[PDB]
Structure 1
Amino acid sequence: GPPSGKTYMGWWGHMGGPKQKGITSYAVSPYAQKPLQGIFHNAVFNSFRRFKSQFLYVLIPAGIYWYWWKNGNEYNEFLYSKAGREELERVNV
């Protein structure tokens, strides 16, 4: 097969990261490891941490656009009622 260009991911053995030295791993078999030991206290406190650091960036745009949609929908159902029909007459023309 033909050669190809320089990529930024190699394969197992020549992956292409920087050379690393003196960094040791430690892992235990999952047969001697108890899974889901960290669901209780975890799904409460870590989930509250993940919500607290991260909710306000979602809650302010939702608040802005929901308030703007609600004000627009309220103004719609105002001016297509009997009370605002002359205003509908002057803004539709």
Structure 2
Amino acid sequence: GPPSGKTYMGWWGHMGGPKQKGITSYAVSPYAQKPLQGIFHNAVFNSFRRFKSQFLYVLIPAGIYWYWWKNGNEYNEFLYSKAGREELERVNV
């Protein structure tokens, strides 16, 4: 086939990153390692670190929308009660 257009990812040998010099990487065989090392420390301290960093972003909009939903639900329950018909007619028409 013909060659296609220029991409941003080559293959093994010509990926297309910059030239690399002076970076040395070391690694050990997994057969010589301990998997599940540090699971009981990461399960309590790392989990708390990640939760402390990323919970206001998730739980402030969740609190806003859940309070909005509960308030609208309470108003809909009030409007179709015996105590709140006399607002329901002047509310809908």
TM-score computed with the length of structure 2 as normaliser: 0.98
CA deviation string 1:36-88 (max 9, x = no partner): 01201110000000000001100000000000000000000001000110110
User: Tell me, which stretches of 5 or more residues in structure 1 are unaligned?
Assistant: none
Moved beyond 3 Å, runs of 4+: none
Cα distance in structure 2, aligned partners of 1:92 and 1:5: 61
Deviation of 1:30 after TM superposition, in Å, equals 0.2
Deviation of 1:34 after TM superposition, in Å, equals 0.5
SS of 1:70's equivalent? helix
User: Tell me, which stretches of 5 or more residues in structure 2 are unaligned?
Assistant: none
Cα distance in structure 2, aligned partners of 1:20 and 1:3: 27
Deviation of 1:92 after TM superposition, in Å, equals 1.0
Cα distance in structure 2, aligned partners of 1:90 and 1:42: 59
Deviation of 1:27 after TM superposition, in Å, equals 0.2
Q: Greater share of helix residues, 1 or 2?
A: 2
Structure 1 vs Structure 2 CA RMSD: 0.5
Aligned residue pair count: 93
